Amino acid sequence: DDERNAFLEVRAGTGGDEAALFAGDLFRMYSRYAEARRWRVEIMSASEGEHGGYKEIIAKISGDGVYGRLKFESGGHRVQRVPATESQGRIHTSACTVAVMPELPDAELPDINPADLRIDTFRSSGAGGQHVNTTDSAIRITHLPTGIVVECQDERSQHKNKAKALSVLGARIHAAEMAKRQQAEASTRRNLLGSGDRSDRNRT
RNA sequence: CCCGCAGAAGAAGCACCGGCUAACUCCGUGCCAGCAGCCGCGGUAAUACGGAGGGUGCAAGCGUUAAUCGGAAUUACUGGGC
RNA sequence: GGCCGCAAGGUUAAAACUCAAAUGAAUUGACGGGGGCCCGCACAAGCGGUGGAGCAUGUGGUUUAAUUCGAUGCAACGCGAAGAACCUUACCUGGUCUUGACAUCCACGGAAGUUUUCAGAGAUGAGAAUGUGCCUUCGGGAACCGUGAGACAGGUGCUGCAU
RNA sequence: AGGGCUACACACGUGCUACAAUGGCGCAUACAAAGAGAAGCGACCUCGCGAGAGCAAGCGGACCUCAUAAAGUGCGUCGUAGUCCGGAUUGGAGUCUGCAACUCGACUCCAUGAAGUCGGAAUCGCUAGUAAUCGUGGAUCAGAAUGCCACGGUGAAUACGU
RNA sequence: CUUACCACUUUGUGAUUCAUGACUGGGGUGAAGUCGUAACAAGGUAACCGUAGGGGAACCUGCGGUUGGAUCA
RNA sequence: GCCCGGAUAGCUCAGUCGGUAGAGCAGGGGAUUGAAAAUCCCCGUGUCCUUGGUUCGAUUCCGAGUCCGGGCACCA
């Protein structure tokens, strides 16, 4: 079904130096909940918040049944209380933003299967004498699925050009796929997180 | 226009009640929902939001929006200043 | 945009948008690494300590079924507590009760109390003798008991930012 | 009814005892103030190494009890060593209060004998019968103070100055 | 029939006005971020004006000017 | 493809001369402050890139391998 591990990250919203304290308190709450469930919590990224807790904490929770119970904590959490960084005795309202995202794999494959490649061999252009004329040293590879084209005529040997262009095509495919995944994840996190403004909230 | 007929028989709504501005209490929500012409209300004991009871102002009308003059001596001839 | 200048630029001179203010003089305080005059074991001169060690005690944190609650700059921390084995105790686990542990009202059968026996961790439940009197117009009423309903009791529950 | 507030990798505050010779240990002997006492204070005598136990007068108290003050002084030993300093921790046997001392009391005897050899950055109290040091009593309380509130003994150094 | 005037229409080259344009320069607004502390007291180097150079930024320095500057027992 | 150089704490980096590894920043505890910085005191390091070998003993010496940095790849 859906019981995979999860990533929990909380960051400050409105308030500044006291939203960091509330983020620390909220992280401590979640950590104690995880500990009294036979789960495991480990901190990957921490940005301390000058006075108190963390301006942003990103940790990974691992167990059986994690995401199925922590997927409802993604949103805004509002706190109304007397801050520690308060000379007078005023009550202040602040907020924090929480994001919970499931753990998903990173299956990457060498999508360089030659059954879906078009290879063109032709003559290079430049100054090479009577040998550059009567030889097919320039190479070009077109990837049928993605549609990327890479052409190479660096060295006099066709095999070196073929290898170099094949490596460049693989690198370009990898970069495109990684950029796609990164933008999808960023958009999902942006929609899940919200914008800490003490007016969009899930609990008080 | 005049006379007769039957029966009170056929005929009341709109805005507002914190100050400016005449007119107050209860319940619901809890910087949310909402109100506002200017100051400004609402953070779990709200005469300012929503409903009820009461009151105030106009009335076959009542309110809102647009436009002009006045207040504005705020282009100062009457009648201002450095 | 125009004029002037080698250039740096000068000169004439708007609009959109945004706020409900911006400003001058003086007034009462507060503050100054501004100026004078003073005081306090506040500095200076001395004496003895604390921070190091072992132990007592309180607090934070952590743990736990609970580790009850409050104070938590100077002005909280041998503080409320002028004294936690049971009690205190307000916390946790388990076993129990519902006008009721603590008061008044109404009705019904009752002197109050003394010795015991069985079951249970105890709360409690069941059983048997024992005294059945005290002012009482011999109508009765009354210190005090159990039951039956409800007006009510009960709260160390929250708000010291309503008092 | 039983348990917890007494937990324990750690951090802080307030204190008690020490790190020794201006001292430790043994023998002998001087000088206080204040306070409490009836389900209470408890003398004498006897038993026990000791905490204590048995019998038991007096006292609602300038009369009786708690209740020998200690530091001090005289003599002797220790002779600078982790020691005849230090008294933590642990094993065994007991006394008392309390129906009930395992978690969780106080005291006693025997055995044991840890850190500690004067304390980093820092920081606290005190101007005279004060600081320092030595003993005594009371409230709470069946039992349970190094805490709190009081009482006396010995008794200093320093203040050019703001 | 022919000539003159002239409407529609056509050609070339300018002016002005409206919308739009890849990039680029500043301006305003913000109940929370990063870097410092330039000004308000002598604001800890008195402040400001004109000008020139420099620098992540408030700003610093050179020349002239002003008091709309504190202390002066 | 050939040649040279490098790999050491969390990050930038010195060092062996075959037996015993350091510096700055950072990190932990405590001081000063109403509080955060600056400042002061105390405290901790790492299988010296992977693998095989010689040695009593390898971070060091000798073979391979991975990654990083630099140079060259000309006449037709």
Added chain:
RNA sequence: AAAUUCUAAU
């Protein structure tokens, strides 16, 4: 003679 800072509801 040294010496930076104090967000956001009374």
Added chain:
RNA sequence: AGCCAGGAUGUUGGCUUAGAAGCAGCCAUCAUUUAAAGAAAGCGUAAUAGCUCACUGGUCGAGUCGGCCUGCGCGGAAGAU
């Protein structure tokens, strides 16, 4: 080898899922009437239904079905005056 006939009984099974009934996939794979019939070799239904095959009686009437050691041939076999 052709040709007639059978090819049955409580598995609508818990297992698994909306239904999986011989035939989606997972374990097992016994028993009964029999001359024979798999608790199923194949086709087919959303699941049923439906049609064949293993095995067995009848006709027929004499040979028939697979391996081994070897000789020679076939396919696999498309290029530029």
Added chain:
RNA sequence: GCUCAACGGAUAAAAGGUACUCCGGGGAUAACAGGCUGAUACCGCCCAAGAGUUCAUAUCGACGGCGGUGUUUGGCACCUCGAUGUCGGCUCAUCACAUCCUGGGGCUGAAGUAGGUCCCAAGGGUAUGGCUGUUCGCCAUUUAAAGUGGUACGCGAGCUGG
């Protein structure tokens, strides 16, 4: 008394450029083309885990295997250095079939229109432009279709010279 280590040691004593070049030779030796080969390139076939809702072979084919051609890049250095002119375009062609269209069929997860795949077949036919010196390639608009290759990767005693 020499790392005369270029170790039978040329002098005690010594680096580079030539696209401004020049002489004597070599196909004893490279670049173009031909030749042998076929690592590479391209095209077929064998077995069948599997994908195809179920079903290996409608259409694909993992792990492996066996061949063909002489279009690419190579290996060798057999011909040519007393000379075989080298890319692209133009004009003109000619052959192979591993067939782009038209022609005849089998199977389809082929209802029809349209397709997929494999056989037979070489008679005829098989674009104009933008960009670039371009071969190659991208784009615009047509066509029944805009085939793949050999010929010194055809064709300069036929043209041009980017």
